[PDB]
Amino acid sequence: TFRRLWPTIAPFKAGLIVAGVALILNAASDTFMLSLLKPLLDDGFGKTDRSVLVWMPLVVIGLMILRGITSYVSSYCISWVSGKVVMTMRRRLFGHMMGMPVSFFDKQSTGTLLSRITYDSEQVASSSSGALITVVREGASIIGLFIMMFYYSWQLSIILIVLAPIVSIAIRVVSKRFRNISKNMQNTMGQVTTSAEQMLKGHKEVLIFGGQEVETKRFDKVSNRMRLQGMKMVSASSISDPIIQLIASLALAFVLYAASFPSVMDSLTAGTITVVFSSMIALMRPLKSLTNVNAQFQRGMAACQTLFTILDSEQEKDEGKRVIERATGDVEFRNVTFTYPGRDVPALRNINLKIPAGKTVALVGRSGSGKSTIASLITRFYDIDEGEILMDGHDLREYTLASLRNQVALVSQNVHLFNDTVANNIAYARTEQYSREQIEEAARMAYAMDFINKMDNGLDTVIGENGVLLSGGQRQRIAIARALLRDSPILILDEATSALDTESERAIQAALDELQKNRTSLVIAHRLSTIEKADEIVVVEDGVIVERGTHNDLLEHRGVYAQLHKMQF
Amino acid sequence: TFRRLWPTIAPFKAGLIVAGVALILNAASDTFMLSLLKPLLDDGFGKTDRSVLVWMPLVVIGLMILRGITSYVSSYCISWVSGKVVMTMRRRLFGHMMGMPVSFFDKQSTGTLLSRITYDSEQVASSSSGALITVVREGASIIGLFIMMFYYSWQLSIILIVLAPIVSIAIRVVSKRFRNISKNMQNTMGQVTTSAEQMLKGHKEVLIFGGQEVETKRFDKVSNRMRLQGMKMVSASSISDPIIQLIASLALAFVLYAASFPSVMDSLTAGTITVVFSSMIALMRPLKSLTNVNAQFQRGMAACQTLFTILDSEQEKDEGKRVIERATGDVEFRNVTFTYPGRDVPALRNINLKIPAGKTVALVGRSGSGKSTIASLITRFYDIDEGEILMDGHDLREYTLASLRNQVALVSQNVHLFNDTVANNIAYARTEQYSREQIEEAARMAYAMDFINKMDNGLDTVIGENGVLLSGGQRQRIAIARALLRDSPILILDEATSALDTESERAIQAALDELQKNRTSLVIAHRLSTIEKADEIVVVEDGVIVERGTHNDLLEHRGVYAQLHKMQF
């Protein structure tokens, strides 16, 4: 249909001209081999010219080195072009895929994304280069054959060509006329077998009514109506093939007769008949493959219309200019209404919260709807529907995304750990600034240097999966080290519940205390010590704030807090 | 394997001789046709203009008809044999499956009994006769072609059949040597695409940590590693075909070289090289199809062991000689316990019953397990386990089958009506002894003559399936007409279902009443129309009958039957 793919191809066309010059020579080295059938039967055994029988082997090996070399120059130089319009347009998606909104990667697409940069990105050039191999090779074999047919004997070529569609249409009308009769009599047999199906259902009355002789004599007339009709299908179906063969071979009598009696013909001498009759046996194969070209240039371009919807899609909204470097202040909510895309229930309904300068606040609860989403609203993973979150006196939508995202931390158990060294995993996208001394000192400050010591090299060993496959405590404390070294002002402590082994909960808890010793903290938690030591607690139950006060006043008014402490304790 | 099918084929062996004489002549006319290539190319065009060219076209249609009328004689006289060893074998199963017990027919095989007569009995002769028209037609063309090979220049034939297996084994070892490299580099591709898969997981940490340019300068070094390994499969998997073609054409070079010898080139003329070379391309297909003569003979004989177990399973137990003409007496039970075959839980517990002469007994209950079982074992559809049943002073085991089953009369709504006329559906298996006037009078005595008079003929019209498609109300009174006409002394009335229809329930109740002025009648009844007038009432409780009394005593003692009236009402 459309070709917007051709600006990608147009840097690399010097591999396509070589694959269309050294591919025609794969078709003119086959119609130059069939023309050797003329001297072999003419100047060869019939005469006493032995010398034509000695150079003919040397032009048979010599014409399949040329058919074995241009089948390698045209399959490699078309793999360099169909390998660099698969490579270029696969790294164009992955410069736009890491800029698309999280909502697309939420539940809209999970694992079919690899099916757009491994499988649906290969069929755009493994089935659209099958519309240039078939057109050029089997579109120049046919011209060579139609030249070799007309140079040798123009008189017989017209006779043979004219008889070609008549045989096909006669065969087609005969086949239709017999499959109609076959379908009719198959329907008749299907009508007959119903009574034989029914005869086995009366077994509960055949025995008690005393008659098996009636039901074994009345089956002698159903089976005899299933043989005299059952033998007629092969009597009316095996007659069609002799008719087809006789119709086909009546024309081969006319081809021989036309080359017999007129003296306008018989310019043929025993090699000019083998080279024209056996050429077009090898012309039927470059006639069934050329007609299936547009069945392949509609799959190799239907898969390009799929990849043009992943691309040119709406990216992150960057309608902001305000830049914040060090967010020292308060974060508050105002009239914030938000629900998840693709869902109906509202999660956020006019929520008013305030985070003071450096004091921690705990959003505890067992609701499972309201605690996890507010980290997304803060980090602007999901944009707010209606309302405003005032971050240091300004809305987040006024702020640029890169400046806003740098002021936050996401310490959690479920971190994904990259395939790089310690100097790169704790210093992601800051390695050109951060020296290794402050990196290793922050690693000691995270109380996880002991696990780095028990390693292959230590501070420059690979970490991520396909490598060492570390445990969750090392992942949590390396996330602690990352957020400690980056020194973010605002911290969303997830504090995920897991196994707390002796002298493993101690190191994790000490690292947590050292991290939250300073700085503002909105902590989601199920930990009793962080519940009691929090300055102000906030409980959200199904999007409803039951109270906003201290833990002692939340002990005085029960509500849901003590009922939560039933399972906390 | 063990062909016991042969005695059903041996009287029809005269069709397998015509189909083995008129099938050889379909393979000696594909050999007598290629031998025309020698007078056409040598004695035809090369010598003169009109020598052999006017005599050949009257042969190429002469051979065609001698092949179109031996593809109809050998395809009809084998289907007279493969359609008469199916018919003899199909109606031998239906002289054995109509005398074999109900233990086959209760859910062991329900719809698969049709696919042992219709489809499975066809594959014993549609796939065992396809292993004879292959071993004879394409086992006589090969012997035919190997005469043309050796009458026409045997030296070239010897040096060509020497050369063929070397080419075959060289092609095989080359294909293996390249498929090893292909699968190894496919695994090498799999590792790289796993490493490419492991990148899109950390989107939630790509955005927040500020690193997007790292993931666009790391995917560049993954895509090049995924392109230089994607070029190499096309580079290394496209060397196999030129090597195969060059190895193949070196043999043709050797043949054309050895044709230059003065010993070989003595009997090779303008002809005699086309017929030898082009008959081998017509010899690969009969050599190929021959190998599958034992992959089809053991498909059409392995389906002759499926239906031979139907022919070998156990039939009726007829170990008995006692007979009775008309059972005028009692039927009594002796603590008989019986469970259905294929089950462990006893469907019927210990039951003790007494049936008087000319009185009604009722097996009333809503349990649905035990009342119909007693009717089955009484008519001896299933043989009993624990004890004996004395019918007229003798056990049922002592009695023969047709003596006992001619004394019962099953009456229900689920009667199956044969597709033969009503004239004989009221006198089934006894239409000769009874004349038409008795059938007419018994039709009026069953109060069903009025609906017969509404029909197209009356006495001799089609009444079963696929005709007028009768209702269950007509089926009830035609069953009463049947059970009144045969005049059985024991009436197992099942009472059908309670569907009162004005002036249909009246006729049904009148026929049901008039049937039972006389004769011993064990009835099963979920309806109250017979219980209040019953002489003796027994009531089954789950699986055991514990209350065997009168109506007034069963009104005095509640038990179960009183509550059965309570939620019956």
From Swiss-Prot, chains A, B:
Record membrane topology: Multi-pass membrane protein
Enzyme class: translocase
Domain of life of the native organism: Bacteria
Reported consequences of knocking out the gene: Absence of MsbA alone causes accumulation of hexa-acylated lipid A species and glycerophospholipids in the inner membrane.
Boundaries of every ABC transporter domain copy: 331-567
Catalytic activity: ATP + H2O + lipid A-core oligosaccharideSide 1 = ADP + phosphate + lipid A-core oligosaccharideSide 2
Residues annotated for ATP binding in this entry: G365, R366, S367, G368, S369, G370, K371, S372
One biological process term in Gene Ontology: lipopolysaccharide transport
Reported regulation of activity: ATPase activity is stimulated by lipid A, hexaacylated lipid A or Kdo(2)-lipid A. Inhibited by the phosphate analog vanadate.
Effect of H526A: Lacks cell viability and does not support growth. Can still bind ATP and slowly hydrolyze ATP, but becomes locked into a closed dimer conformation
Name of the protein in its database record: ATP-dependent lipid A-core flippase
Record organism: Escherichia coli (strain K12)
Lineage: Bacteria, Pseudomonadati, Pseudomonadota, Gammaproteobacteria, Enterobacterales
